[PDB]
Structure formats: structure tokens, C-alpha cells
Amino acid sequence: CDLPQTHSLGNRRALILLAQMRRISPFSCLKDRHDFEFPQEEFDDKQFQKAQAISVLHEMIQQTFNLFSTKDSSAALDETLLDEFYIELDQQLNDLESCVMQEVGVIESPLMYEDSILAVRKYFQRITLYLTEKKYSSCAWEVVRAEIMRSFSLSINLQKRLKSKE
């Protein structure tokens, strides 16, 4: 797809707001630290590429937008930080959505779609049920929120297929 400006490490988009959820106290939770946000199965180097990333990334971001925008999780974050989240995803969504129209091919496979889409829905579904048990206390959202950072990390870097992290 059309490159924005050479290859960069981070995205500098939505990473700032995510950091705001790092001030939490480590004493909030311990055994409640899991990763159900970013499906690593799809984000792993087992079979991940630039175009392919657009497939998973799109669903990953689109889902996050619905999480807060649904009012449920929105009430969890400050209206200021939350409201910014809506626009933040929009910028990233356009990047992927644009590739869809480009007719690259990776975002057309009716069968491959399930593997990419399901990977996000399956993991994203855990977060909904996971938080339900805690009724959105504070750490439950942090563990899931902080997890989003990883999805953004490998998403815009793994494509290069250069060095991972075990």
C-alpha cells in the first residue's frame, strides 16, 4: 500500500493515551495479568506480513473502537482520554481501510478472513467475559488496556520480520 513516510519503529498514534493507563499501582492485581487483547497467534511470526497485518490489525483496532464507544468501557476511562481514543483509532482504521479498497488481495480471501477475524474475535471475546467477572474494577481494564500496547507493537514492526521477542 501507499507508504506514509519510509519505515518507522513506533506509530506515535494512540501510544500516548495508552501510557496514561500505566500509572496504575502494581498492587492492584497479580494473577489477573493475561493477554486476551492482541491475538498473538495472528500477530506471531509464524505467518505474519505487511499486507496480512492489515487484515488482523484492522479487526483488532475496529474492535477496540467498539469497546469504549459502546459506553461500557468508555465510562471506565476519562471522557477526555476516552474521547481521544475514538479519533485515535480512526486514523489507524483509515490506513487499513484504504488497503481494502486497493484490492491487494490479502483483504479479500473469504476463507482467510475467518482465520484473521476469528483470531481477534476469540481473544477480544475473552476480555468482555473476563472484565464481567471483575465488573470493571480497575486492574482488569489495565491488564487488557496495557495488552493493547503489544498489539500495536508487533502490528507495526512484526511485518518487517526482523527480530522478535521469543
Which features does this protein show?
166 residues, mainly alpha, Growth Hormone, Chain: A, 6 helices, 57% helix, globular, cytokine activity, Interferon alpha-8
Named CATH architecture: Up-down Bundle
Global geometry: globular
CATH topology: Growth Hormone, Chain: A
**Quantity of strands, as a count:** 0
What is the number of helices? 6
The SSE order reads HHHHHH
Query: CATH top level?
Result: Mainly Alpha
Beta-sheet strand percentage?
A: under 5%
Q: Gyration radius, to the nearest Å?
A: 16 Å
The helix/strand class is: mainly alpha
Largest sheet features = none
Q: How much helical structure, as a percent, in the residues?
A: 55-70%
Q: List the domain count as a whole number.
A: 1
Terminal Cα separation, in Å? 29 Å
Main location: secreted
GO molecular function: cytokine activity; cytokine receptor binding; type I interferon receptor binding
Function: Produced by macrophages, IFN-alpha have antiviral activities. Interferon stimulates the production of two enzymes: a protein kinase and an oligoadenylate synthetase.
GO cellular component, one term: extracellular region
Describe, in plain words, how this protein is organized in 3D.
It is classed as cytokine. The entry lists the keywords Interferon alpha8, cytokine. The assembly is monomeric. This protein is mainly alpha-helical and 166 residues long. It has a single domain, classed as Up-down Bundle (Growth Hormone, Chain: A). Helices cover 57% and strands 0% of the residues. Helix 3 runs antiparallel to helix 4 (79-102) and helix 3 runs parallel beside helix 5 (110-134).
